[PDB]
Protein backbone atom coordinates (compact mmCIF):
# COMPACT_ATOMS: atom_id res chain seq x y z
CA UNK A 1 0.00 0.00 0.00
CA UNK A 2 0.96 3.68 0.47
CA UNK A 3 3.35 4.67 3.28
CA UNK A 4 4.69 7.68 5.19
CA UNK A 5 7.72 8.67 7.21
CA UNK A 6 7.50 11.56 9.64
CA UNK A 7 9.70 13.21 12.19
CA UNK A 8 7.92 15.24 14.87
CA UNK A 9 9.61 17.70 17.20
CA UNK A 10 8.31 19.71 20.16
CA UNK A 11 10.25 22.25 22.24
CA UNK A 12 8.50 23.77 25.27
CA UNK A 13 10.10 26.64 27.16
CA UNK A 14 9.83 26.76 30.96
CA UNK A 15 11.37 30.05 32.16
CA UNK A 16 12.90 29.71 35.63
CA UNK A 17 12.87 25.86 35.35
CA UNK A 18 15.88 25.40 33.09
CA UNK A 19 16.14 25.11 29.34
CA UNK A 20 13.27 24.13 27.03
CA UNK A 21 12.42 20.44 26.97
CA UNK A 22 12.90 18.92 23.49
CA UNK A 23 11.14 15.73 22.43
CA UNK A 24 11.33 14.25 18.95
CA UNK A 25 9.84 11.02 17.61
CA UNK A 26 9.99 9.31 14.25
CA UNK A 27 7.25 7.24 12.66
CA UNK A 28 6.79 5.01 9.66
CA UNK A 29 3.01 5.02 9.16
CA UNK A 30 1.56 4.50 12.69
CA UNK A 31 4.67 2.79 14.03
CA UNK A 32 6.98 4.78 16.35
CA UNK A 33 10.55 3.75 15.58
CA UNK A 34 12.87 6.29 17.26
CA UNK A 35 12.68 8.76 20.15
CA UNK A 36 14.84 11.43 21.80
CA UNK A 37 14.05 13.39 24.99
CA UNK A 38 16.44 16.08 26.26
CA UNK A 39 15.24 15.33 29.86
CA UNK A 40 16.53 11.70 29.69
CA UNK A 41 19.60 10.88 31.88
CA UNK A 42 21.92 10.42 28.90
CA UNK A 43 19.98 11.77 25.91
CA UNK A 44 20.38 9.70 22.78
CA UNK A 45 18.08 8.72 19.99
CA UNK A 46 16.76 5.35 21.16
CA UNK A 47 15.25 2.69 18.89
CA UNK A 48 11.59 1.74 19.41
CA UNK A 49 11.26 -0.89 16.62
CA UNK A 50 13.48 -3.95 16.09
CA UNK A 51 14.23 -3.17 12.44
CA UNK A 52 16.13 0.06 13.25
CA UNK A 53 18.71 -1.41 15.70
CA UNK A 54 20.33 -3.34 12.75
CA UNK A 55 21.41 0.04 11.29
CA UNK A 56 24.38 0.05 13.63
CA UNK A 57 26.01 2.44 16.09
CA UNK A 58 27.26 4.96 13.42
CA UNK A 59 23.61 5.42 12.34
CA UNK A 60 22.53 5.93 15.97
CA UNK A 61 25.33 8.43 16.65
CA UNK A 62 24.57 10.45 13.51
CA UNK A 63 20.88 10.59 14.57
CA UNK A 64 21.68 11.53 18.16
CA UNK A 65 23.92 14.37 16.93
CA UNK A 66 21.14 15.71 14.70
CA UNK A 67 18.71 15.58 17.65
CA UNK A 68 21.08 17.52 19.89
CA UNK A 69 21.61 20.14 17.12
CA UNK A 70 17.90 20.57 16.49
CA UNK A 71 17.27 21.01 20.28
CA UNK A 72 19.80 23.89 20.14
CA UNK A 73 18.36 25.47 17.00
CA UNK A 74 14.93 25.28 18.58
CA UNK A 75 16.14 27.03 21.74
CA UNK A 76 17.56 29.83 19.58
CA UNK A 77 14.34 29.94 17.50
CA UNK A 78 12.21 30.24 20.68
CA UNK A 79 14.28 33.29 21.64
CA UNK A 80 13.86 34.73 18.12
CA UNK A 81 10.05 34.33 18.23
CA UNK A 82 9.82 36.22 21.49
CA UNK A 83 11.38 39.13 19.58
CA UNK A 84 9.22 38.70 16.45
CA UNK A 85 5.99 38.59 18.52
CA UNK A 86 7.04 41.28 21.06
CA UNK A 87 6.61 38.80 23.94
CA UNK A 88 8.05 38.84 27.42
CA UNK A 89 10.61 36.30 28.62
CA UNK A 90 8.17 35.19 31.39
CA UNK A 91 5.76 32.79 29.63
CA UNK A 92 6.07 29.21 28.40
CA UNK A 93 5.95 28.84 24.59
CA UNK A 94 5.87 25.89 22.19
CA UNK A 95 7.62 25.21 18.94
CA UNK A 96 6.53 22.23 16.77
CA UNK A 97 8.00 20.96 13.55
CA UNK A 98 7.07 18.06 11.34
CA UNK A 99 8.71 16.91 8.14
CA UNK A 100 8.72 13.79 6.03
CA UNK A 101 7.45 12.09 2.93
CA UNK A 102 4.67 9.95 1.55
CA UNK A 103 5.33 7.20 -1.04
CA UNK A 104 2.96 5.10 -3.13
CA UNK A 105 2.82 1.26 -3.38
CA UNK A 106 5.61 1.48 -6.02
CA UNK A 107 7.77 3.52 -3.59
CA UNK A 108 7.55 6.69 -5.72
CA UNK A 109 7.34 10.07 -3.89
CA UNK A 110 3.68 11.20 -3.54
CA UNK A 111 4.54 14.36 -1.54
CA UNK A 112 6.97 15.92 0.91
CA UNK A 113 6.34 18.06 4.02
CA UNK A 114 8.16 20.54 6.21
CA UNK A 115 6.06 22.69 8.52
CA UNK A 116 6.33 24.63 11.75
CA UNK A 117 3.92 25.96 14.37
CA UNK A 118 4.40 28.38 17.27
CA UNK A 119 2.10 28.17 20.27
CA UNK A 120 -0.10 25.75 18.40
CA UNK A 121 -0.66 28.04 15.38
CA UNK A 122 0.79 27.71 11.88
CA UNK A 123 4.06 29.61 11.51
CA UNK A 124 5.69 28.65 8.17
CA UNK A 125 5.20 25.70 5.83
CA UNK A 126 6.94 24.44 2.75
CA UNK A 127 4.39 24.21 -0.05
CA UNK A 128 3.65 20.96 -1.89
CA UNK A 129 5.89 22.20 -4.76
CA UNK A 130 8.87 21.87 -2.38
CA UNK A 131 9.95 25.24 -3.79
CA UNK A 132 7.90 28.02 -2.17
CA UNK A 133 6.62 28.96 1.29
CA UNK A 134 3.39 29.81 3.08
CA UNK A 135 4.07 32.19 6.02
CA UNK A 136 1.16 32.66 8.42
CA UNK A 137 1.86 36.29 9.37
CA UNK A 138 4.37 39.13 9.18
CA UNK A 139 6.69 37.50 11.78
CA UNK A 140 6.90 34.27 9.70
CA UNK A 141 7.49 36.43 6.59
CA UNK A 142 10.83 37.45 8.18
CA UNK A 143 11.78 33.75 8.34
CA UNK A 144 10.46 33.27 4.76
CA UNK A 145 12.72 36.07 3.47
CA UNK A 146 15.71 34.52 5.31
CA UNK A 147 14.95 31.05 3.94
CA UNK A 148 14.43 32.37 0.37
CA UNK A 149 17.80 34.18 0.55
CA UNK A 150 19.52 30.98 1.79
CA UNK A 151 17.67 28.70 -0.73
CA UNK A 152 16.42 26.48 2.17
CA UNK A 153 13.55 25.09 0.02
CA UNK A 154 16.04 23.67 -2.47
CA UNK A 155 17.92 21.90 0.32
CA UNK A 156 14.68 20.47 1.71
CA UNK A 157 13.53 19.36 -1.70
CA UNK A 158 16.82 17.45 -2.17
CA UNK A 159 16.37 15.69 1.19
CA UNK A 160 12.66 14.95 0.73
CA UNK A 161 13.00 13.50 -2.76
CA UNK A 162 16.28 11.74 -1.94
CA UNK A 163 17.16 10.41 1.51
CA UNK A 164 13.61 10.61 2.85
CA UNK A 165 12.19 8.40 0.09
CA UNK A 166 15.17 6.02 -0.06
CA UNK A 167 15.42 5.46 3.69
CA UNK A 168 11.63 4.99 3.99
CA UNK A 169 11.87 2.28 1.27
CA UNK A 170 14.77 0.69 3.19
CA UNK A 171 12.83 0.63 6.49
CA UNK A 172 9.75 -0.76 4.73
CA UNK A 173 11.83 -3.69 3.47
CA UNK A 174 13.72 -4.30 6.72
CA UNK A 175 10.53 -4.08 8.76
CA UNK A 176 8.26 -5.76 6.16
CA UNK A 177 6.96 -8.31 8.70
CA UNK A 178 5.17 -5.54 10.61
CA UNK A 179 5.21 -2.38 8.47
CA UNK A 180 3.74 -4.17 5.46
CA UNK A 181 1.21 -6.23 7.43
CA UNK A 182 -2.32 -4.85 7.89
CA UNK A 183 -4.13 -6.39 10.90
CA UNK A 184 -7.89 -6.34 10.30
CA UNK A 185 -10.33 -5.18 12.96
CA UNK A 186 -12.00 -7.74 15.26
CA UNK A 187 -15.60 -6.54 15.35
CA UNK A 188 -18.82 -6.88 17.32
CA UNK A 189 -22.08 -5.01 17.98
CA UNK A 190 -23.34 -4.41 21.53
CA UNK A 191 -26.89 -3.36 22.59
CA UNK A 192 -27.65 -1.23 25.68
CA UNK A 193 -31.29 -0.23 26.60
CA UNK A 194 -31.48 3.50 27.59
CA UNK A 195 -35.23 3.68 28.41
CA UNK A 196 -38.22 1.55 27.52
CA UNK A 197 -38.37 3.34 24.09
CA UNK A 198 -34.72 3.55 23.00
CA UNK A 199 -31.46 1.57 23.06
CA UNK A 200 -27.88 2.14 21.97
CA UNK A 201 -26.24 0.02 19.31
CA UNK A 202 -22.41 0.24 19.49
CA UNK A 203 -20.25 -1.10 16.69
CA UNK A 204 -16.70 -2.02 17.77
CA UNK A 205 -13.43 -2.40 15.85
CA UNK A 206 -10.42 -3.68 17.86
CA UNK A 207 -6.91 -4.92 17.15
CA UNK A 208 -6.41 -3.22 13.79
CA UNK A 209 -3.34 -1.72 12.14
CA UNK A 210 -2.83 0.82 10.52
CA UNK A 211 -5.07 3.31 12.34
CA UNK A 212 -7.01 4.32 9.19
CA UNK A 213 -10.53 2.81 9.29
CA UNK A 214 -14.08 3.69 8.24
CA UNK A 215 -16.91 2.75 10.70
CA UNK A 216 -20.41 3.84 9.89
CA UNK A 217 -24.02 3.07 10.77
CA UNK A 218 -26.80 2.91 8.20
CA UNK A 219 -30.55 2.77 8.78
CA UNK A 220 -32.48 1.11 5.90
CA UNK A 221 -29.27 1.52 3.83
CA UNK A 222 -29.05 5.31 4.53
CA UNK A 223 -25.90 6.74 6.27
CA UNK A 224 -26.56 8.13 9.78
CA UNK A 225 -23.65 10.68 9.88
CA UNK A 226 -25.50 13.28 12.06
CA UNK A 227 -26.87 10.68 14.50
CA UNK A 228 -23.71 8.57 14.92
CA UNK A 229 -21.45 9.10 17.97
CA UNK A 230 -17.92 8.33 16.68
CA UNK A 231 -14.97 8.22 19.15
CA UNK A 232 -11.48 9.13 17.98
CA UNK A 233 -9.40 6.12 16.93
CA UNK A 234 -7.29 5.23 20.00
CA UNK A 235 -4.11 3.21 20.55
CA UNK A 236 -4.37 -0.12 22.40
CA UNK A 237 -0.66 -0.07 23.41
CA UNK A 238 0.37 -3.31 21.50
CA UNK A 239 0.68 -1.49 18.08
CA UNK A 240 -3.01 -1.78 17.30
CA UNK A 241 -5.88 0.65 17.37
CA UNK A 242 -9.52 0.70 18.47
CA UNK A 243 -12.64 2.61 17.50
CA UNK A 244 -16.38 2.50 18.03
CA UNK A 245 -19.50 4.09 16.52
CA UNK A 246 -22.85 4.25 18.32
CA UNK A 247 -26.46 5.12 17.36
CA UNK A 248 -29.59 5.61 19.54
CA UNK A 249 -32.36 3.49 18.06
CA UNK A 250 -36.12 3.25 18.74
CA UNK A 251 -37.01 -0.01 20.54
CA UNK A 252 -37.86 -2.76 18.07
CA UNK A 253 -36.15 -1.03 15.08
CA UNK A 254 -32.65 -2.65 15.64
CA UNK A 255 -32.82 -4.98 12.54
CA UNK A 256 -32.93 -1.90 10.22
CA UNK A 257 -29.47 -0.75 11.35
CA UNK A 258 -26.25 -2.04 9.84
CA UNK A 259 -22.68 -1.22 10.78
CA UNK A 260 -20.19 -0.97 7.91
CA UNK A 261 -16.45 -1.55 8.41
CA UNK A 262 -13.72 -0.77 5.86
CA UNK A 263 -10.01 -1.51 6.65
CA UNK A 264 -6.92 -2.63 4.61
CA UNK A 265 -6.50 -5.89 6.60
CA UNK A 266 -9.95 -7.30 5.82
CA UNK A 267 -10.50 -9.89 2.99
CA UNK A 268 -13.18 -7.21 2.07
CA UNK A 269 -15.77 -4.95 3.93
CA UNK A 270 -18.00 -6.08 6.75
CA UNK A 271 -21.75 -5.53 7.23
CA UNK A 272 -22.73 -6.20 10.83
CA UNK A 273 -26.00 -6.24 12.78
CA UNK A 274 -26.88 -6.63 16.43
CA UNK A 275 -27.19 -10.41 16.61
CA UNK A 276 -29.40 -11.44 19.68
Amino acid sequence: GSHSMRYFHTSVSRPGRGEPRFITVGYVDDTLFVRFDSDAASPREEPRAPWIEQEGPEYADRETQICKAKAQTDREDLRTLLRYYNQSEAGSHTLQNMYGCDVGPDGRLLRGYHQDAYDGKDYIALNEDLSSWTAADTAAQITQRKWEAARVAEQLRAYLEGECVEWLRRYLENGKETLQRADPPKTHVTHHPISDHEATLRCWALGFYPAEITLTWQRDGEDQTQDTELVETRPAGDRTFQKWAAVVVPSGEEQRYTCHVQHEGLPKPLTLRWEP
Partner: peptide, 9 residues
Protein backbone atom coordinates in the same frame (compact mmCIF):
# COMPACT_ATOMS: atom_id res chain seq x y z
CA UNK B 1 16.91 8.94 8.36
CA UNK B 2 16.69 12.51 9.66
CA UNK B 3 17.67 15.53 7.65
CA UNK B 4 21.07 16.76 8.93
CA UNK B 5 20.45 20.36 7.72
CA UNK B 6 20.07 23.16 10.27
CA UNK B 7 17.92 26.21 9.55
CA UNK B 8 17.12 29.10 11.94
CA UNK B 9 14.04 31.29 12.03
Amino acid sequence: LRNQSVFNF
